[PDB]
PDB file of N, CA and C in Angstrom:
ATOM      1  N   UNK A   5     186.806 -38.204-134.176  1.00 20.58           N
ATOM      2  CA  UNK A   5     186.714 -37.767-135.563  1.00 20.58           C
ATOM      3  C   UNK A   5     186.242 -36.320-135.650  1.00 20.58           C
ATOM      4  N   UNK A   6     186.877 -35.546-136.531  1.00 20.80           N
ATOM      5  CA  UNK A   6     186.516 -34.148-136.721  1.00 20.80           C
ATOM      6  C   UNK A   6     185.115 -33.966-137.289  1.00 20.80           C
ATOM      7  N   UNK A   7     184.540 -35.000-137.894  1.00 21.74           N
ATOM      8  CA  UNK A   7     183.199 -34.935-138.462  1.00 21.74           C
ATOM      9  C   UNK A   7     182.191 -35.435-137.435  1.00 21.74           C
ATOM     10  N   UNK A   8     181.237 -34.574-137.085  1.00 20.16           N
ATOM     11  CA  UNK A   8     180.095 -34.951-136.261  1.00 20.16           C
ATOM     12  C   UNK A   8     178.915 -35.193-137.186  1.00 20.16           C
ATOM     13  N   UNK A   9     178.020 -36.081-136.778  1.00 19.16           N
ATOM     14  CA  UNK A   9     177.326 -36.962-137.705  1.00 19.16           C
ATOM     15  C   UNK A   9     176.005 -37.373-137.058  1.00 19.16           C
ATOM     16  N   UNK A  10     174.926 -36.708-137.452  1.00 16.80           N
ATOM     17  CA  UNK A  10     173.737 -36.540-136.619  1.00 16.80           C
ATOM     18  C   UNK A  10     172.548 -37.231-137.281  1.00 16.80           C
ATOM     19  N   UNK A  11     171.693 -37.909-136.517  1.00 16.79           N
ATOM     20  CA  UNK A  11     170.400 -38.383-137.045  1.00 16.79           C
ATOM     21  C   UNK A  11     169.368 -37.263-137.053  1.00 16.79           C
ATOM     22  N   UNK A  12     168.148 -37.496-137.579  1.00 15.94           N
ATOM     23  CA  UNK A  12     167.350 -36.355-138.079  1.00 15.94           C
ATOM     24  C   UNK A  12     166.833 -35.401-137.015  1.00 15.94           C
ATOM     25  N   UNK A  13     166.095 -35.887-136.020  1.00 16.17           N
ATOM     26  CA  UNK A  13     165.586 -34.994-134.983  1.00 16.17           C
ATOM     27  C   UNK A  13     166.512 -35.046-133.782  1.00 16.17           C
ATOM     28  N   UNK A  14     167.805 -35.135-134.058  1.00 13.81           N
ATOM     29  CA  UNK A  14     168.833 -35.135-133.037  1.00 13.81           C
ATOM     30  C   UNK A  14     169.552 -33.796-133.051  1.00 13.81           C
ATOM     31  N   UNK A  15     170.339 -33.578-132.006  1.00 16.44           N
ATOM     32  CA  UNK A  15     171.074 -32.340-131.813  1.00 16.44           C
ATOM     33  C   UNK A  15     172.159 -32.611-130.781  1.00 16.44           C
ATOM     34  N   UNK A  16     173.270 -31.890-130.897  1.00 20.52           N
ATOM     35  CA  UNK A  16     174.387 -32.039-129.973  1.00 20.52           C
ATOM     36  C   UNK A  16     174.858 -30.655-129.551  1.00 20.52           C
ATOM     37  N   UNK A  17     175.546 -30.606-128.417  1.00 19.37           N
ATOM     38  CA  UNK A  17     176.077 -29.372-127.866  1.00 19.37           C
ATOM     39  C   UNK A  17     177.531 -29.229-128.288  1.00 19.37           C
ATOM     40  N   UNK A  18     177.841 -28.129-128.966  1.00 18.89           N
ATOM     41  CA  UNK A  18     179.188 -27.866-129.450  1.00 18.89           C
ATOM     42  C   UNK A  18     179.873 -26.916-128.479  1.00 18.89           C
ATOM     43  N   UNK A  19     180.984 -27.368-127.908  1.00 16.57           N
ATOM     44  CA  UNK A  19     181.722 -26.596-126.920  1.00 16.57           C
ATOM     45  C   UNK A  19     182.750 -25.728-127.630  1.00 16.57           C
ATOM     46  N   UNK A  20     182.384 -24.475-127.881  1.00 14.70           N
ATOM     47  CA  UNK A  20     183.253 -23.534-128.583  1.00 14.70           C
ATOM     48  C   UNK A  20     184.330 -23.080-127.612  1.00 14.70           C
ATOM     49  N   UNK A  21     185.359 -23.913-127.425  1.00 14.55           N
ATOM     50  CA  UNK A  21     186.296 -23.539-126.365  1.00 14.55           C
ATOM     51  C   UNK A  21     187.117 -22.300-126.703  1.00 14.55           C
ATOM     52  N   UNK A  22     186.847 -21.596-127.800  1.00 16.26           N
ATOM     53  CA  UNK A  22     187.226 -20.193-127.911  1.00 16.26           C
ATOM     54  C   UNK A  22     186.317 -19.296-127.084  1.00 16.26           C
ATOM     55  N   UNK A  23     185.107 -19.765-126.772  1.00 16.82           N
ATOM     56  CA  UNK A  23     184.161 -19.033-125.942  1.00 16.82           C
ATOM     57  C   UNK A  23     183.351 -19.938-125.015  1.00 16.82           C
ATOM     58  N   UNK A  24     183.520 -21.259-125.110  1.00 20.78           N
ATOM     59  CA  UNK A  24     182.645 -22.256-124.492  1.00 20.78           C
ATOM     60  C   UNK A  24     181.174 -21.928-124.670  1.00 20.78           C
ATOM     61  N   UNK A  25     180.807 -21.263-125.760  1.00 24.06           N
ATOM     62  CA  UNK A  25     179.402 -20.996-126.020  1.00 24.06           C
ATOM     63  C   UNK A  25     178.813 -22.313-126.501  1.00 24.06           C
ATOM     64  N   UNK A  26     178.383 -23.136-125.554  1.00 23.94           N
ATOM     65  CA  UNK A  26     177.776 -24.404-125.896  1.00 23.94           C
ATOM     66  C   UNK A  26     176.394 -24.125-126.461  1.00 23.94           C
ATOM     67  N   UNK A  27     176.207 -24.503-127.718  1.00 23.30           N
ATOM     68  CA  UNK A  27     174.962 -24.207-128.401  1.00 23.30           C
ATOM     69  C   UNK A  27     174.471 -25.481-129.058  1.00 23.30           C
ATOM     70  N   UNK A  28     173.175 -25.670-129.020  1.00 24.62           N
ATOM     71  CA  UNK A  28     172.558 -26.824-129.650  1.00 24.62           C
ATOM     72  C   UNK A  28     172.687 -26.672-131.158  1.00 24.62           C
ATOM     73  N   UNK A  29     173.166 -27.723-131.811  1.00 24.55           N
ATOM     74  CA  UNK A  29     173.191 -27.787-133.263  1.00 24.55           C
ATOM     75  C   UNK A  29     172.068 -28.713-133.696  1.00 24.55           C
ATOM     76  N   UNK A  30     170.868 -28.155-133.835  1.00 25.25           N
ATOM     77  CA  UNK A  30     169.682 -28.912-134.209  1.00 25.25           C
ATOM     78  C   UNK A  30     169.951 -29.558-135.560  1.00 25.25           C
ATOM     79  N   UNK A  31     169.863 -30.881-135.598  1.00 24.21           N
ATOM     80  CA  UNK A  31     170.187 -31.616-136.792  1.00 24.21           C
ATOM     81  C   UNK A  31     169.075 -31.537-137.812  1.00 24.21           C
ATOM     82  N   UNK A  32     169.215 -32.296-138.901  1.00 27.69           N
ATOM     83  CA  UNK A  32     170.409 -33.103-139.148  1.00 27.69           C
ATOM     84  C   UNK A  32     171.323 -32.491-140.207  1.00 27.69           C
ATOM     85  N   UNK A  33     172.623 -32.762-140.118  1.00 30.09           N
ATOM     86  CA  UNK A  33     173.586 -32.208-141.063  1.00 30.09           C
ATOM     87  C   UNK A  33     174.947 -32.839-140.814  1.00 30.09           C
ATOM     88  N   UNK A  34     175.815 -32.738-141.822  1.00 29.44           N
ATOM     89  CA  UNK A  34     177.209 -33.165-141.698  1.00 29.44           C
ATOM     90  C   UNK A  34     178.020 -31.989-141.171  1.00 29.44           C
ATOM     91  N   UNK A  35     177.735 -31.621-139.929  1.00 32.16           N
ATOM     92  CA  UNK A  35     178.452 -30.528-139.304  1.00 32.16           C
ATOM     93  C   UNK A  35     179.921 -30.905-139.135  1.00 32.16           C
ATOM     94  N   UNK A  36     180.794 -29.936-139.386  1.00 29.15           N
ATOM     95  CA  UNK A  36     182.232 -30.160-139.328  1.00 29.15           C
ATOM     96  C   UNK A  36     182.792 -29.387-138.144  1.00 29.15           C
ATOM     97  N   UNK A  37     183.707 -30.028-137.419  1.00 28.61           N
ATOM     98  CA  UNK A  37     184.225 -29.482-136.172  1.00 28.61           C
ATOM     99  C   UNK A  37     185.681 -29.077-136.320  1.00 28.61           C
ATOM    100  N   UNK A  38     185.933 -27.779-136.223  1.00 27.17           N
ATOM    101  CA  UNK A  38     187.182 -27.279-135.682  1.00 27.17           C
ATOM    102  C   UNK A  38     187.148 -27.463-134.170  1.00 27.17           C
ATOM    103  N   UNK A  39     188.275 -27.201-133.512  1.00 28.38           N
ATOM    104  CA  UNK A  39     188.206 -27.227-132.057  1.00 28.38           C
ATOM    105  C   UNK A  39     187.661 -25.889-131.567  1.00 28.38           C
ATOM    106  N   UNK A  40     186.560 -25.462-132.180  1.00 24.53           N
ATOM    107  CA  UNK A  40     185.752 -24.345-131.720  1.00 24.53           C
ATOM    108  C   UNK A  40     184.278 -24.718-131.740  1.00 24.53           C
ATOM    109  N   UNK A  41     183.971 -25.993-131.957  1.00 26.00           N
ATOM    110  CA  UNK A  41     182.617 -26.528-131.892  1.00 26.00           C
ATOM    111  C   UNK A  41     182.649 -27.914-131.251  1.00 26.00           C
ATOM    112  N   UNK A  42     183.466 -28.067-130.207  1.00 27.45           N
ATOM    113  CA  UNK A  42     183.759 -29.372-129.616  1.00 27.45           C
ATOM    114  C   UNK A  42     182.503 -30.109-129.164  1.00 27.45           C
ATOM    115  N   UNK A  43     182.294 -31.312-129.704  1.00 29.60           N
ATOM    116  CA  UNK A  43     181.135 -32.121-129.345  1.00 29.60           C
ATOM    117  C   UNK A  43     181.256 -32.577-127.896  1.00 29.60           C
ATOM    118  N   UNK A  44     180.112 -32.747-127.232  1.00 29.56           N
ATOM    119  CA  UNK A  44     180.080 -33.141-125.827  1.00 29.56           C
ATOM    120  C   UNK A  44     179.596 -34.574-125.628  1.00 29.56           C
ATOM    121  N   UNK A  45     178.449 -34.934-126.203  1.00 28.31           N
ATOM    122  CA  UNK A  45     177.837 -36.230-125.933  1.00 28.31           C
ATOM    123  C   UNK A  45     177.547 -36.968-127.237  1.00 28.31           C
ATOM    124  N   UNK A  46     176.765 -38.037-127.113  1.00 29.63           N
ATOM    125  CA  UNK A  46     176.604 -39.041-128.155  1.00 29.63           C
ATOM    126  C   UNK A  46     175.354 -38.775-128.989  1.00 29.63           C
ATOM    127  N   UNK A  47     175.132 -39.567-130.058  1.00 29.58           N
ATOM    128  CA  UNK A  47     173.897 -39.418-130.844  1.00 29.58           C
ATOM    129  C   UNK A  47     172.672 -40.076-130.215  1.00 29.58           C
ATOM    130  N   UNK A  48     172.718 -40.342-128.907  1.00 27.22           N
ATOM    131  CA  UNK A  48     171.605 -40.928-128.161  1.00 27.22           C
ATOM    132  C   UNK A  48     170.303 -40.189-128.465  1.00 27.22           C
ATOM    133  N   UNK A  49     169.195 -40.931-128.524  1.00 31.64           N
ATOM    134  CA  UNK A  49     167.964 -40.484-129.174  1.00 31.64           C
ATOM    135  C   UNK A  49     167.340 -39.236-128.553  1.00 31.64           C
ATOM    136  N   UNK A  50     167.294 -39.157-127.220  1.00 33.35           N
ATOM    137  CA  UNK A  50     166.665 -38.042-126.506  1.00 33.35           C
ATOM    138  C   UNK A  50     165.179 -37.925-126.872  1.00 33.35           C
ATOM    139  N   UNK A  51     164.429 -38.933-126.415  1.00 32.77           N
ATOM    140  CA  UNK A  51     163.012 -39.056-126.744  1.00 32.77           C
ATOM    141  C   UNK A  51     162.233 -37.793-126.356  1.00 32.77           C
TER     142      UNK A  51
ATOM    143  N   UNK B   5     201.056 -30.628-130.914  1.00 32.49           N
ATOM    144  CA  UNK B   5     200.355 -29.870-129.883  1.00 32.49           C
ATOM    145  C   UNK B   5     199.382 -28.873-130.504  1.00 32.49           C
ATOM    146  N   UNK B   6     198.183 -28.784-129.927  1.00 33.16           N
ATOM    147  CA  UNK B   6     197.166 -27.863-130.415  1.00 33.16           C
ATOM    148  C   UNK B   6     197.559 -26.401-130.253  1.00 33.16           C
ATOM    149  N   UNK B   7     198.525 -26.098-129.391  1.00 34.32           N
ATOM    150  CA  UNK B   7     198.985 -24.733-129.170  1.00 34.32           C
ATOM    151  C   UNK B   7     200.187 -24.454-130.063  1.00 34.32           C
ATOM    152  N   UNK B   8     200.057 -23.440-130.918  1.00 33.51           N
ATOM    153  CA  UNK B   8     201.169 -22.925-131.708  1.00 33.51           C
ATOM    154  C   UNK B   8     201.699 -21.684-131.010  1.00 33.51           C
ATOM    155  N   UNK B   9     202.989 -21.426-131.169  1.00 34.85           N
ATOM    156  CA  UNK B   9     203.798 -20.845-130.108  1.00 34.85           C
ATOM    157  C   UNK B   9     204.977 -20.128-130.761  1.00 34.85           C
ATOM    158  N   UNK B  10     204.863 -18.812-130.897  1.00 33.21           N
ATOM    159  CA  UNK B  10     205.555 -18.048-131.933  1.00 33.21           C
ATOM    160  C   UNK B  10     206.529 -17.071-131.282  1.00 33.21           C
ATOM    161  N   UNK B  11     207.728 -16.894-131.837  1.00 35.01           N
ATOM    162  CA  UNK B  11     208.615 -15.794-131.415  1.00 35.01           C
ATOM    163  C   UNK B  11     208.214 -14.482-132.077  1.00 35.01           C
ATOM    164  N   UNK B  12     208.868 -13.350-131.743  1.00 34.66           N
ATOM    165  CA  UNK B  12     208.193 -12.047-131.931  1.00 34.66           C
ATOM    166  C   UNK B  12     207.969 -11.627-133.375  1.00 34.66           C
ATOM    167  N   UNK B  13     209.017 -11.558-134.194  1.00 38.61           N
ATOM    168  CA  UNK B  13     208.829 -11.160-135.585  1.00 38.61           C
ATOM    169  C   UNK B  13     208.745 -12.402-136.453  1.00 38.61           C
ATOM    170  N   UNK B  14     208.092 -13.429-135.925  1.00 36.93           N
ATOM    171  CA  UNK B  14     207.864 -14.670-136.635  1.00 36.93           C
ATOM    172  C   UNK B  14     206.403 -14.749-137.048  1.00 36.93           C
ATOM    173  N   UNK B  15     206.124 -15.710-137.917  1.00 38.28           N
ATOM    174  CA  UNK B  15     204.796 -15.918-138.468  1.00 38.28           C
ATOM    175  C   UNK B  15     204.764 -17.318-139.064  1.00 38.28           C
ATOM    176  N   UNK B  16     203.585 -17.931-139.053  1.00 37.15           N
ATOM    177  CA  UNK B  16     203.405 -19.270-139.596  1.00 37.15           C
ATOM    178  C   UNK B  16     202.155 -19.282-140.463  1.00 37.15           C
ATOM    179  N   UNK B  17     202.088 -20.259-141.358  1.00 37.12           N
ATOM    180  CA  UNK B  17     200.966 -20.427-142.266  1.00 37.12           C
ATOM    181  C   UNK B  17     200.002 -21.444-141.674  1.00 37.12           C
ATOM    182  N   UNK B  18     198.757 -21.026-141.476  1.00 35.98           N
ATOM    183  CA  UNK B  18     197.730 -21.884-140.900  1.00 35.98           C
ATOM    184  C   UNK B  18     196.881 -22.447-142.029  1.00 35.98           C
ATOM    185  N   UNK B  19     196.855 -23.771-142.135  1.00 34.27           N
ATOM    186  CA  UNK B  19     196.130 -24.453-143.195  1.00 34.27           C
ATOM    187  C   UNK B  19     194.706 -24.722-142.735  1.00 34.27           C
ATOM    188  N   UNK B  20     193.793 -23.831-143.108  1.00 33.86           N
ATOM    189  CA  UNK B  20     192.390 -23.939-142.716  1.00 33.86           C
ATOM    190  C   UNK B  20     191.750 -25.028-143.562  1.00 33.86           C
ATOM    191  N   UNK B  21     191.971 -26.290-143.182  1.00 28.85           N
ATOM    192  CA  UNK B  21     191.490 -27.323-144.102  1.00 28.85           C
ATOM    193  C   UNK B  21     189.971 -27.408-144.166  1.00 28.85           C
ATOM    194  N   UNK B  22     189.222 -26.503-143.539  1.00 25.79           N
ATOM    195  CA  UNK B  22     187.853 -26.234-143.958  1.00 25.79           C
ATOM    196  C   UNK B  22     187.805 -25.419-145.242  1.00 25.79           C
ATOM    197  N   UNK B  23     188.883 -24.695-145.552  1.00 29.08           N
ATOM    198  CA  UNK B  23     188.990 -23.914-146.778  1.00 29.08           C
ATOM    199  C   UNK B  23     190.395 -23.923-147.373  1.00 29.08           C
ATOM    200  N   UNK B  24     191.368 -24.548-146.701  1.00 29.31           N
ATOM    201  CA  UNK B  24     192.795 -24.426-146.998  1.00 29.31           C
ATOM    202  C   UNK B  24     193.213 -22.991-147.257  1.00 29.31           C
ATOM    203  N   UNK B  25     192.547 -22.021-146.640  1.00 29.56           N
ATOM    204  CA  UNK B  25     192.960 -20.634-146.789  1.00 29.56           C
ATOM    205  C   UNK B  25     194.198 -20.476-145.921  1.00 29.56           C
ATOM    206  N   UNK B  26     195.352 -20.782-146.497  1.00 32.08           N
ATOM    207  CA  UNK B  26     196.599 -20.640-145.777  1.00 32.08           C
ATOM    208  C   UNK B  26     196.904 -19.158-145.657  1.00 32.08           C
ATOM    209  N   UNK B  27     196.955 -18.687-144.418  1.00 27.24           N
ATOM    210  CA  UNK B  27     197.146 -17.270-144.173  1.00 27.24           C
ATOM    211  C   UNK B  27     198.251 -17.113-143.149  1.00 27.24           C
ATOM    212  N   UNK B  28     199.066 -16.106-143.349  1.00 26.67           N
ATOM    213  CA  UNK B  28     200.143 -15.806-142.423  1.00 26.67           C
ATOM    214  C   UNK B  28     199.531 -15.302-141.124  1.00 26.67           C
ATOM    215  N   UNK B  29     199.968 -15.879-140.012  1.00 21.70           N
ATOM    216  CA  UNK B  29     199.601 -15.393-138.691  1.00 21.70           C
ATOM    217  C   UNK B  29     200.799 -14.648-138.133  1.00 21.70           C
ATOM    218  N   UNK B  30     200.906 -13.366-138.473  1.00 22.43           N
ATOM    219  CA  UNK B  30     202.014 -12.523-138.047  1.00 22.43           C
ATOM    220  C   UNK B  30     202.031 -12.508-136.528  1.00 22.43           C
ATOM    221  N   UNK B  31     203.147 -12.937-135.953  1.00 22.67           N
ATOM    222  CA  UNK B  31     203.253 -13.060-134.525  1.00 22.67           C
ATOM    223  C   UNK B  31     203.459 -11.717-133.865  1.00 22.67           C
ATOM    224  N   UNK B  32     203.705 -11.734-132.553  1.00 26.54           N
ATOM    225  CA  UNK B  32     203.699 -12.967-131.767  1.00 26.54           C
ATOM    226  C   UNK B  32     202.443 -13.112-130.911  1.00 26.54           C
ATOM    227  N   UNK B  33     202.038 -14.347-130.628  1.00 23.64           N
ATOM    228  CA  UNK B  33     200.837 -14.597-129.839  1.00 23.64           C
ATOM    229  C   UNK B  33     200.742 -16.084-129.535  1.00 23.64           C
ATOM    230  N   UNK B  34     199.942 -16.409-128.517  1.00 24.08           N
ATOM    231  CA  UNK B  34     199.629 -17.798-128.184  1.00 24.08           C
ATOM    232  C   UNK B  34     198.406 -18.216-128.990  1.00 24.08           C
ATOM    233  N   UNK B  35     198.597 -18.287-130.302  1.00 23.97           N
ATOM    234  CA  UNK B  35     197.517 -18.693-131.179  1.00 23.97           C
ATOM    235  C   UNK B  35     197.138 -20.144-130.891  1.00 23.97           C
ATOM    236  N   UNK B  36     195.837 -20.410-130.909  1.00 24.63           N
ATOM    237  CA  UNK B  36     195.317 -21.732-130.592  1.00 24.63           C
ATOM    238  C   UNK B  36     194.734 -22.336-131.860  1.00 24.63           C
ATOM    239  N   UNK B  37     195.004 -23.625-132.061  1.00 27.42           N
ATOM    240  CA  UNK B  37     194.647 -24.306-133.298  1.00 27.42           C
ATOM    241  C   UNK B  37     193.544 -25.322-133.060  1.00 27.42           C
ATOM    242  N   UNK B  38     192.383 -25.063-133.643  1.00 30.73           N
ATOM    243  CA  UNK B  38     191.499 -26.122-134.096  1.00 30.73           C
ATOM    244  C   UNK B  38     192.091 -26.717-135.366  1.00 30.73           C
ATOM    245  N   UNK B  39     191.496 -27.808-135.845  1.00 31.91           N
ATOM    246  CA  UNK B  39     191.960 -28.294-137.139  1.00 31.91           C
ATOM    247  C   UNK B  39     191.274 -27.489-138.239  1.00 31.91           C
ATOM    248  N   UNK B  40     191.304 -26.168-138.084  1.00 30.43           N
ATOM    249  CA  UNK B  40     190.924 -25.217-139.116  1.00 30.43           C
ATOM    250  C   UNK B  40     191.961 -24.111-139.221  1.00 30.43           C
ATOM    251  N   UNK B  41     193.099 -24.272-138.552  1.00 29.86           N
ATOM    252  CA  UNK B  41     194.233 -23.362-138.642  1.00 29.86           C
ATOM    253  C   UNK B  41     195.531 -24.165-138.623  1.00 29.86           C
ATOM    254  N   UNK B  42     195.540 -25.298-139.329  1.00 29.96           N
ATOM    255  CA  UNK B  42     196.627 -26.271-139.249  1.00 29.96           C
ATOM    256  C   UNK B  42     197.988 -25.666-139.580  1.00 29.96           C
ATOM    257  N   UNK B  43     198.926 -25.762-138.636  1.00 30.46           N
ATOM    258  CA  UNK B  43     200.268 -25.231-138.835  1.00 30.46           C
ATOM    259  C   UNK B  43     200.988 -26.042-139.906  1.00 30.46           C
ATOM    260  N   UNK B  44     201.887 -25.385-140.641  1.00 33.61           N
ATOM    261  CA  UNK B  44     202.618 -26.028-141.729  1.00 33.61           C
ATOM    262  C   UNK B  44     204.090 -26.253-141.394  1.00 33.61           C
ATOM    263  N   UNK B  45     204.798 -25.213-140.952  1.00 31.74           N
ATOM    264  CA  UNK B  45     206.242 -25.303-140.764  1.00 31.74           C
ATOM    265  C   UNK B  45     206.626 -24.869-139.352  1.00 31.74           C
ATOM    266  N   UNK B  46     207.928 -24.672-139.161  1.00 33.17           N
ATOM    267  CA  UNK B  46     208.539 -24.548-137.846  1.00 33.17           C
ATOM    268  C   UNK B  46     208.714 -23.083-137.456  1.00 33.17           C
ATOM    269  N   UNK B  47     209.174 -22.813-136.216  1.00 34.16           N
ATOM    270  CA  UNK B  47     209.450 -21.424-135.817  1.00 34.16           C
ATOM    271  C   UNK B  47     210.777 -20.877-136.331  1.00 34.16           C
ATOM    272  N   UNK B  48     211.339 -21.500-137.372  1.00 32.27           N
ATOM    273  CA  UNK B  48     212.587 -21.062-137.999  1.00 32.27           C
ATOM    274  C   UNK B  48     212.548 -19.562-138.288  1.00 32.27           C
ATOM    275  N   UNK B  49     213.695 -18.895-138.135  1.00 31.02           N
ATOM    276  CA  UNK B  49     213.762 -17.443-137.981  1.00 31.02           C
ATOM    277  C   UNK B  49     213.227 -16.656-139.175  1.00 31.02           C
ATOM    278  N   UNK B  50     213.560 -17.075-140.399  1.00 29.92           N
ATOM    279  CA  UNK B  50     213.161 -16.369-141.621  1.00 29.92           C
ATOM    280  C   UNK B  50     213.707 -14.935-141.628  1.00 29.92           C
ATOM    281  N   UNK B  51     215.036 -14.863-141.753  1.00 29.11           N
ATOM    282  CA  UNK B  51     215.755 -13.594-141.680  1.00 29.11           C
ATOM    283  C   UNK B  51     215.220 -12.584-142.703  1.00 29.11           C
TER     284      UNK B  51
END
């Protein structure tokens, strides 16, 4: 799904394959993905 | 295909459905599409 969808103190790495500048998107928000913010992993808690 | 693929004096309209700012991409180039530059029509010549 083009919509990435984050719990509150969660964050995911977006693979900007225009630059592969993988950057943490500190949540939470309804971040929207073009294929320039490609998500890598899951909403796993990361205690 | 995520790769749009243009002949020389050709151009296509990219539907940025983050904004639907449909803009002509005057060719030619190996333009790459996230779903923020959605192609609309074909490489038809447009004399």
